[PDB]
Design an enzyme around this catalytic site. Sequence first.
Site, PDB file in Angstrom:
ATOM      1  N   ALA A  64      -7.411   1.902   7.657  1.00 34.11           N
ATOM      2  CA  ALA A  64      -6.018   2.176   7.962  1.00 34.11           C
ATOM      3  C   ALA A  64      -5.865   2.809   9.362  1.00 34.11           C
ATOM      4  CB  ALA A  64      -5.408   3.062   6.857  1.00 34.11           C
ATOM      5  N   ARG A  70      -8.168  18.834  23.356  1.00 37.19           N
ATOM      6  CA  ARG A  70      -6.870  18.653  23.999  1.00 37.19           C
ATOM      7  C   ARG A  70      -6.458  17.182  23.918  1.00 37.19           C
ATOM      8  NH1 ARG A  70      -8.965  22.646  26.721  1.00 37.19           N
ATOM      9  NH2 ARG A  70      -7.669  24.440  27.347  1.00 37.19           N
ATOM     10  N   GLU A  93      -5.667   9.444   4.668  1.00 34.50           N
ATOM     11  CA  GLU A  93      -6.041  10.377   5.734  1.00 34.50           C
ATOM     12  C   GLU A  93      -5.086  11.545   5.837  1.00 34.50           C
ATOM     13  OE1 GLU A  93      -2.896   8.353   6.494  1.00 34.50           O
ATOM     14  OE2 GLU A  93      -4.584   7.106   7.131  1.00 34.50           O
ATOM     15  N   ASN A  96      -7.303   5.272  10.851  1.00 39.80           N
ATOM     16  CA  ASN A  96      -8.642   5.450  11.406  1.00 39.80           C
ATOM     17  C   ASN A  96      -9.109   4.239  12.205  1.00 39.80           C
ATOM     18  OD1 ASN A  96     -11.623   6.746  11.025  1.00 39.80           O
ATOM     19  ND2 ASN A  96     -11.722   4.557  10.552  1.00 39.80           N
ATOM     20  N   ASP A 118       0.812  -1.211   0.000  1.00 40.77           N
ATOM     21  CA  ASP A 118       0.000   0.000   0.000  1.00 40.77           C
ATOM     22  C   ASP A 118       0.850   1.268   0.000  1.00 40.77           C
ATOM     23  OD1 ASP A 118      -2.520  -1.211  -0.164  1.00 40.77           O
ATOM     24  OD2 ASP A 118      -2.553  -1.567   1.992  1.00 40.77           O
ATOM     25  N   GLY A 119       2.020   1.217   0.641  1.00 39.67           N
ATOM     26  CA  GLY A 119       2.960   2.331   0.592  1.00 39.67           C
ATOM     27  C   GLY A 119       3.356   2.683  -0.836  1.00 39.67           C
ATOM     28  N   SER A 168      -7.317   1.913  13.693  1.00 37.34           N
ATOM     29  CA  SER A 168      -6.537   1.795  14.920  1.00 37.34           C
ATOM     30  C   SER A 168      -6.957   2.816  15.974  1.00 37.34           C
ATOM     31  CB  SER A 168      -5.045   1.970  14.631  1.00 37.34           C
ATOM     32  OG  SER A 168      -4.645   1.054  13.664  1.00 37.34           O
ATOM     33  N   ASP A 225      -3.483  14.177  21.828  1.00 32.54           N
ATOM     34  CA  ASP A 225      -2.311  13.888  21.003  1.00 32.54           C
ATOM     35  C   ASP A 225      -2.488  14.430  19.601  1.00 32.54           C
ATOM     36  OD1 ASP A 225      -0.916  12.717  23.029  1.00 32.54           O
ATOM     37  OD2 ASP A 225      -1.121  10.664  22.310  1.00 32.54           O
ATOM     38  N   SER A 277     -11.873   4.842   2.014  1.00 33.05           N
ATOM     39  CA  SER A 277     -10.901   3.759   1.845  1.00 33.05           C
ATOM     40  C   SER A 277      -9.818   3.814   2.933  1.00 33.05           C
ATOM     41  CB  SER A 277     -10.321   3.728   0.423  1.00 33.05           C
ATOM     42  OG  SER A 277      -9.621   4.914   0.079  1.00 33.05           O
TER      43      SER A 277
HETATM   44  C1  LIG Z   1       3.516   2.612   5.327  1.00 33.23           C
HETATM   45  C2  LIG Z   1       2.453   2.502   4.903  1.00 33.23           C
HETATM   46  C3  LIG Z   1       1.113   2.369   4.416  1.00 33.23           C
HETATM   47  O1  LIG Z   1       0.538   3.607   4.522  1.00 33.23           O
HETATM   48  C4  LIG Z   1       0.824   4.237   5.737  1.00 33.23           C
HETATM   49  C5  LIG Z   1      -0.481   4.190   6.428  1.00 33.23           C
HETATM   50  O2  LIG Z   1      -0.190   3.728   7.662  1.00 33.23           O
HETATM   51  C6  LIG Z   1      -1.300   3.999   8.418  1.00 33.23           C
HETATM   52  N1  LIG Z   1      -0.809   4.176   9.769  1.00 33.23           N
HETATM   53  C7  LIG Z   1       0.116   5.004  10.183  1.00 33.23           C
HETATM   54  N2  LIG Z   1       0.267   4.858  11.482  1.00 33.23           N
HETATM   55  C8  LIG Z   1      -0.559   3.931  11.902  1.00 33.23           C
HETATM   56  C9  LIG Z   1      -0.875   3.354  13.123  1.00 33.23           C
HETATM   57  N3  LIG Z   1      -0.308   3.661  14.255  1.00 33.23           N
HETATM   58  N4  LIG Z   1      -1.799   2.422  13.140  1.00 33.23           N
HETATM   59  C10 LIG Z   1      -2.406   2.048  12.061  1.00 33.23           C
HETATM   60  N5  LIG Z   1      -2.142   2.579  10.915  1.00 33.23           N
HETATM   61  C11 LIG Z   1      -1.235   3.511  10.802  1.00 33.23           C
HETATM   62  C12 LIG Z   1      -1.887   5.290   7.840  1.00 33.23           C
HETATM   63  O3  LIG Z   1      -3.164   5.030   7.368  1.00 33.23           O
HETATM   64  C13 LIG Z   1      -0.955   5.595   6.685  1.00 33.23           C
HETATM   65  O4  LIG Z   1      -1.619   6.109   5.549  1.00 33.23           O
HETATM   66  C1  LIG Z   2       1.294  19.150  31.729  1.00 33.35           C
HETATM   67  C2  LIG Z   2       0.995  18.420  32.564  1.00 33.35           C
HETATM   68  C3  LIG Z   2       0.604  17.484  33.576  1.00 33.35           C
HETATM   69  O1  LIG Z   2       1.393  16.377  33.405  1.00 33.35           O
HETATM   70  C4  LIG Z   2       1.524  16.005  32.064  1.00 33.35           C
HETATM   71  C5  LIG Z   2       0.734  14.759  32.006  1.00 33.35           C
HETATM   72  O2  LIG Z   2      -0.056  14.912  30.924  1.00 33.35           O
HETATM   73  C6  LIG Z   2      -0.538  13.659  30.649  1.00 33.35           C
HETATM   74  N1  LIG Z   2      -0.768  13.642  29.219  1.00 33.35           N
HETATM   75  C7  LIG Z   2       0.086  13.913  28.267  1.00 33.35           C
HETATM   76  N2  LIG Z   2      -0.515  13.782  27.104  1.00 33.35           N
HETATM   77  C8  LIG Z   2      -1.761  13.429  27.311  1.00 33.35           C
HETATM   78  C9  LIG Z   2      -2.860  13.132  26.518  1.00 33.35           C
HETATM   79  N3  LIG Z   2      -2.864  13.173  25.215  1.00 33.35           N
HETATM   80  N4  LIG Z   2      -3.979  12.803  27.120  1.00 33.35           N
HETATM   81  C10 LIG Z   2      -4.066  12.748  28.409  1.00 33.35           C
HETATM   82  N5  LIG Z   2      -3.055  13.005  29.169  1.00 33.35           N
HETATM   83  C11 LIG Z   2      -1.903  13.344  28.659  1.00 33.35           C
HETATM   84  C12 LIG Z   2       0.573  12.691  31.069  1.00 33.35           C
HETATM   85  O3  LIG Z   2       0.091  11.866  32.073  1.00 33.35           O
HETATM   86  C13 LIG Z   2       1.636  13.618  31.619  1.00 33.35           C
HETATM   87  O4  LIG Z   2       2.297  13.102  32.757  1.00 33.35           O
HETATM   88  C1  LIG Z   3       2.786   2.622  10.468  1.00 38.03           C
HETATM   89  C2  LIG Z   3       2.773   1.807   9.637  1.00 38.03           C
HETATM   90  C3  LIG Z   3       2.709   0.813   8.588  1.00 38.03           C
HETATM   91  O1  LIG Z   3       1.509   0.163   8.769  1.00 38.03           O
HETATM   92  C4  LIG Z   3       0.581   0.593   7.854  1.00 38.03           C
HETATM   93  C5  LIG Z   3      -0.231  -0.651   7.683  1.00 38.03           C
HETATM   94  O2  LIG Z   3      -1.513  -0.355   7.202  1.00 38.03           O
HETATM   95  C6  LIG Z   3      -1.642  -0.828   5.879  1.00 38.03           C
HETATM   96  N1  LIG Z   3      -2.501   0.093   5.113  1.00 38.03           N
HETATM   97  C7  LIG Z   3      -2.154   1.155   4.415  1.00 38.03           C
HETATM   98  N2  LIG Z   3      -3.227   1.682   3.898  1.00 38.03           N
HETATM   99  C8  LIG Z   3      -4.256   0.965   4.275  1.00 38.03           C
HETATM  100  C9  LIG Z   3      -5.611   1.019   4.055  1.00 38.03           C
HETATM  101  N3  LIG Z   3      -6.157   1.945   3.326  1.00 38.03           N
HETATM  102  N4  LIG Z   3      -6.380   0.104   4.599  1.00 38.03           N
HETATM  103  C10 LIG Z   3      -5.878  -0.855   5.329  1.00 38.03           C
HETATM  104  N5  LIG Z   3      -4.604  -0.952   5.554  1.00 38.03           N
HETATM  105  C11 LIG Z   3      -3.784  -0.056   5.044  1.00 38.03           C
HETATM  106  C12 LIG Z   3      -0.229  -0.926   5.382  1.00 38.03           C
HETATM  107  O3  LIG Z   3      -0.232  -1.905   4.395  1.00 38.03           O
HETATM  108  C13 LIG Z   3       0.419  -1.501   6.605  1.00 38.03           C
HETATM  109  O4  LIG Z   3       0.004  -2.856   6.781  1.00 38.03           O
END
Ligand SMILES: C#CCOC[C@H]1O[C@@H](n2cnc3c(N)ncnc32)[C@H](O)[C@@H]1O
Ligand SMILES: C#CCOC[C@H]1O[C@@H](n2cnc3c(N)ncnc32)[C@H](O)[C@@H]1O
Ligand SMILES: C#CCOC[C@H]1O[C@@H](n2cnc3c(N)ncnc32)[C@H](O)[C@@H]1O
Lengths: 258, 258, 258, 258
Positions: A156, A142, A117, A158, A45-46, A160, A144, A152
């Site tokens: 991906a 507030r 995405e 989304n 897919d990449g 997760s 990440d 489509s």
């Molecule tokens: C490499 C490769 C395939 O395409 C990258 C795709 O990875 C997917 N991706 C990136 N990070 C994550 C992630 N943490 N979990 C699942 N999917 C992810 C996202 O949809 C992006 O378009």
């Molecule tokens: C600033 C401040 C208070 O402490 C930071 C804390 O924010 C929390 N934190 C960081 N990012 C996120 C996050 N995305 N959602 C919820 N909590 C978060 C995490 O526990 C970290 O120790």
């Molecule tokens: C971070 C990272 C790599 O992981 C991305 C994973 O999502 C897969 N991927 C990329 N695009 C899509 C997609 N559109 N739907 C499902 N899986 C996808 C890609 O093949 C790989 O398995």
Amino acid sequence: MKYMITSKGDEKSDLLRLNMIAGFGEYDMEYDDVEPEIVISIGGDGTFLSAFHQYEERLDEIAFIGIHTGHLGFYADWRPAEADKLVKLLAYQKVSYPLLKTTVKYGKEATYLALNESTVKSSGGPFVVDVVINDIHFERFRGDGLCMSTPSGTTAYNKSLGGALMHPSIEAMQLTEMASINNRVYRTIGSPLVFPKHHVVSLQPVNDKDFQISVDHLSILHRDVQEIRYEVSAKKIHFARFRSFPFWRRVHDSFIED
Amino acid sequence: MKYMITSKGDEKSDLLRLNMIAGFGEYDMEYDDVEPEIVISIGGDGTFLSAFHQYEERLDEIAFIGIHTGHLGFYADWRPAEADKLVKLLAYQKVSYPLLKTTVKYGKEATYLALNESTVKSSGGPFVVDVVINDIHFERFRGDGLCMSTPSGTTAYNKSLGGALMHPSIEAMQLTEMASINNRVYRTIGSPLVFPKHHVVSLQPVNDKDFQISVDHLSILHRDVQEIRYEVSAKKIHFARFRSFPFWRRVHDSFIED
Amino acid sequence: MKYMITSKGDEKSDLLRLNMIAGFGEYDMEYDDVEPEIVISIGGDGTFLSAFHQYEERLDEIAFIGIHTGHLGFYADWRPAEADKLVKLLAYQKVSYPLLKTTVKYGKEATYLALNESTVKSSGGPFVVDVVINDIHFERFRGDGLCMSTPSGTTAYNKSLGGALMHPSIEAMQLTEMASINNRVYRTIGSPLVFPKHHVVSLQPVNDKDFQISVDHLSILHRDVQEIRYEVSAKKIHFARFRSFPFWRRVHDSFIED
Amino acid sequence: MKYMITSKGDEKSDLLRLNMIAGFGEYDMEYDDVEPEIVISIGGDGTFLSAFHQYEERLDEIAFIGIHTGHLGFYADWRPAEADKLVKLLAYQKVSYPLLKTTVKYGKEATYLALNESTVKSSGGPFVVDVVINDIHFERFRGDGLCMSTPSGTTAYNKSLGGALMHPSIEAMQLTEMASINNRVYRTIGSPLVFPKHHVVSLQPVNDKDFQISVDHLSILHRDVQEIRYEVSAKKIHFARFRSFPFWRRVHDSFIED
Ligand SMILES: C#CCOC[C@H]1O[C@@H](n2cnc3c(N)ncnc32)[C@H](O)[C@@H]1O
Ligand SMILES: C#CCOC[C@H]1O[C@@H](n2cnc3c(N)ncnc32)[C@H](O)[C@@H]1O
Ligand SMILES: C#CCOC[C@H]1O[C@@H](n2cnc3c(N)ncnc32)[C@H](O)[C@@H]1O
Ligand SMILES: C#CCOC[C@H]1O[C@@H](n2cnc3c(N)ncnc32)[C@H](O)[C@@H]1O
Ligand SMILES: C#CCOC[C@H]1O[C@@H](n2cnc3c(N)ncnc32)[C@H](O)[C@@H]1O
Ligand SMILES: C#CCOC[C@H]1O[C@@H](n2cnc3c(N)ncnc32)[C@H](O)[C@@H]1O
Ligand SMILES: C#CCOC[C@H]1O[C@@H](n2cnc3c(N)ncnc32)[C@H](O)[C@@H]1O
Ligand SMILES: C#CCOC[C@H]1O[C@@H](n2cnc3c(N)ncnc32)[C@H](O)[C@@H]1O
């Protein structure tokens, strides 16, 4: 018919590419990687995502085909063993999937097209944005970051993030949260949100104005941002289909068992 | 114009109903609860759901309005204090939301219309069904049950099950899992699934054939079931709108702050 | 040493049981299903759960062993092919897991012991309870129900509800929500909660006082309930272990790959 | 008794600090910010976290107190209006919470103590690590990252990742996933995992060896990593408590309503 082939660049994919080229040589087919009408992607897919972005300015002139020599290969419709059948067959009906337009504005403006995405996170530091739907303030987010997915793309990143899987015949975009803070003071919707065509979702900075913005796994730091704007694109990606491989079967094969 | 008013049946709602009736008495308006063209519901969403089902055979002849004297009141567009303004104004544009058709088959067949959702659970004992999408077997589901939601239903039971919130202009239905088992042996998609019009989702029993089936919080035990079938209805519910109250604002007011 | 064997009751399990009995016949071992000191369960986790409840009044006198001829078999430590090795070996160290005490009070009182979990749902109709932790009111819960899990239970129903997996050496119980309503009006913690020994969680009815209460997949309707009370039991279940099979390896084998 | 006060550094907090100092001046109390025995933090949880790390080498000699002039202030036990009551009262029982030890190894070795959590993400690029529990390989994790939380940390980042809330009397650490990929090819446990004292969780790189590692919202890029190791610390943080403010009440006040 004008065509080109991209390759993941491993030995398997390069040889497969050379073989299809040799095979196309026996038909009325011209290799042209400037103005192809058919773009064949050989890899995962990449590789397919790169092919799409290589030609995102001629999307309405092109029909894409993916061959899988990668790992998962979700935009792939063919196994390599079927490659000669494909060159012949290609010597077909077109299927269109919706795309996502991202507009980034500063203090000019850049637009990007996504097949999977677009996401936003901060350039380090806390991420806080106001989420504005069709000019109406909806929530202060507030956490990440946020992910806006095409249909489509829903299988991906989304997926997760807890997003719904959405049949690509639905013209929509889906917004999911990454690790939102929710307490006495801070409140987000929590749920994924699915938006139709013509709805505009705008993210507006609260303090920091530097963000890491991704479109299909290409990530760039954008500085001095005033707005990030999301909308279903008017443009679509076109696939050449030579047989039925329904979306839900594609989902079943990739997640349940194949 | 023919109209009727339902009431939650508490003192507040009955008096409000009597007052609007008195007020309609000063215009060319006939109270008719057999063939109304306007149906006013005074109460919560439960009251509104009952109104919809009271008249589900004349949905294309009717436009609904909800007044909230309940608790949450998500299908409500009016506060009671605004009731006289409404009688006058009503003396308007129509808005349509999609509905869900459920077909239950035995060994004849019954169909039901839902405004929020239809769910399936077992009649006690383990719940196991085969999920078949457009004649293709997708997964074997083990767990507590399944929920199929309309777009307007997405903010209801669907939301609590992790479903996405879906703008009601999208003609779709959304399937969410209730507590699915996932291990080495058993596997479901996990994610919510959003289906377009014309897709058919069919649940087929594996062992037990008795199920508790709900449509909008009315729950019935069905025996000797061969199939439960889901599809976006061809029928729609029509609302009379007298002002703009966008769906996302309605979501914001109900979940974020009002 | 006194022992007994339960069987799932299929052909495989009955024969395996008869064979082990024949084998125990060659040692100083007495079959006694009134006062066994060893209880062997041959079947799945359902069979094991039944064995535990068959002897829950003599838990401190008994050490359990599970042989798997079922499907998943999570409390199983042995494959059938290893059965003769087990009879010999048994002719060992004891491992203890924590249990959950449920107290149900009316207007007398009943107590139950769980190895996996205890859940509460309504007898049909909306489920609403006040959740009181150590005499302090914590939340009013609206939704499908609640699940209180032991550590070993965390891989079961708890897991499907989004609960954490908890090493059974931790003396705790874990409370998870089933489909809680969360809006402008109604609010729950959302997250699973893990409680130590000596903390008491009490559920108190708001309107309806009839509930369906489950302990390890045995479900009973309880009428006229004033309180449901949860606490880590002082009692423990004892396993005979003949080899190392760590909990996390057991989790890996059951959920990741075996 | 030796003491020091940190301040968030806004006007409210600085004045409150000066006032308490003036007040301590009327007792046998010495201001010493090198070897305090009491550390008072005036501000939010960020201020408290900084205080803890300022003195993490003398944790067994110190008892901490938090006063809230911040926003949420979860480690805060006092409102500012109560400050004079606190100086007097302080002129008490100690409460201990568990901490997390992180060991990072290269090709020497660094250790860090966390009060909330330690997280790992990649230095840009895909994140892939092997997760090894007590020397046994448990899973290969693909996704955004991983979070290891203390009990008191469970209400923080852990909570947003779907982790369970854990009473701080439980000596444990909790591992949650950030956006793990799960398909036909890739598999993680999904669920949070709660580990007891003496269990070691080790993350081992697969390809890339550069990671962004955070301890309590201080984030550093670590290069050439061979291992990241997690374990419940032998060290504890000690709070001075002057009144009962139970953890679950603290959770209720911060998330349900105050
Ligand atoms: C490499 C490769 C395939 O395409 C990258 C795709 O990875 C997917 N991706 C990136 N990070 C994550 C992630 N943490 N979990 C699942 N999917 C992810 C996202 O949809 C992006 O378009
Ligand atoms: C600033 C401040 C208070 O402490 C930071 C804390 O924010 C929390 N934190 C960081 N990012 C996120 C996050 N995305 N959602 C919820 N909590 C978060 C995490 O526990 C970290 O120790
Ligand atoms: C971070 C990272 C790599 O992981 C991305 C994973 O999502 C897969 N991927 C990329 N695009 C899509 C997609 N559109 N739907 C499902 N899986 C996808 C890609 O093949 C790989 O398995
Ligand atoms: C079980 C139960 C009662 O809870 C149902 C809750 O959901 C509300 N509700 C009903 N329909 C919808 C709906 N369509 N969207 C959002 N909330 C809804 C209803 O008002 C009530 O607050
Ligand atoms: C009563 C009432 C309002 O309508 C009932 C609605 O309650 C919703 N509902 C039922 N059970 C739950 C539930 N457990 N959580 C959230 N919503 C629920 C569902 O959408 C149903 O249509
Ligand atoms: C409803 C139902 C039957 O599904 C229960 C599933 O969970 C399994 N199970 C029972 N107890 C546990 C348990 N304690 N841990 C993990 N799985 C368990 C049981 O073997 C079966 O695979
Ligand atoms: C049958 C069997 C094994 O034991 C029953 C176990 O099934 C588990 N269970 C019941 N319903 C579900 C469910 N819906 N999902 C996952 N596990 C479930 C629960 O832990 C119960 O103790
Ligand atoms: C990113 C960021 C800032 O958000 C961190 C939020 O979590 C809060 N926080 C920090 N530590 C904890 C904590 N341990 N428990 C609950 N909330 C916490 C902090 O006060 C702030 O409200």
